[PDB]
Amino acid sequence: SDTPYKADLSRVHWAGSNSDVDIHLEIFEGDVDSGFMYNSFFRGNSSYVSVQDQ
Amino acid sequence: SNQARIDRMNTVTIKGRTPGQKLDRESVKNDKLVITVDTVTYASTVMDWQDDWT
């Protein structure tokens, strides 16, 4: 239930006297969560009149 | 600069003399004229985008 080399392992990003402290780096790839999107259904078809600048 | 200068001067006088008398001598006088600019004149007008769009 146990293998040799167990007390002599080298652990790269584990620090401390006995290599217990984690020092690893976080990996980020852009994804962000802010809130659900919404699509309007009245805007698609209706009566429209343009008054801009008159 | 903000100043300009001009010079001014006086004239002489005629006198009379007879034998044995000394000749009098008269000193001309000087001054100056200076003009300065201090005040700005302007006209300004402002409008709002909400009123511009209509």
List the helices and strands and how they pair.
This is part of a larger assembly, with two copies of chain A (54 residues).
Chain A: E1 14-15, E2 21-22
Antiparallel strand pairs in A: 1-2
Protein name (chain A): Putative capsid protein
Organism (chain A): Pectobacterium phage PhiM1
PDB class: virus
Describe the structure concisely for a colleague.
The structure is cut from a larger assembly and holds 2 copies of chain A (54 residues). Chain A contains no helices and 2 strands.
Task: Describe what you observe in this structure.
This is part of a larger assembly, with 2 copies of chain A (54 residues). With 54 residues, chain A is mostly loops. Chain A is 0% helix and 7% strand. Chain A has no helices and 2 strands. In chain A, strands 1-2 form a two-stranded antiparallel ribbon. The radius of gyration of chain A is 30 Å and the shape is rod-shaped. The termini of chain A are far apart. Chains A and B meet through loops of A and loops of B.
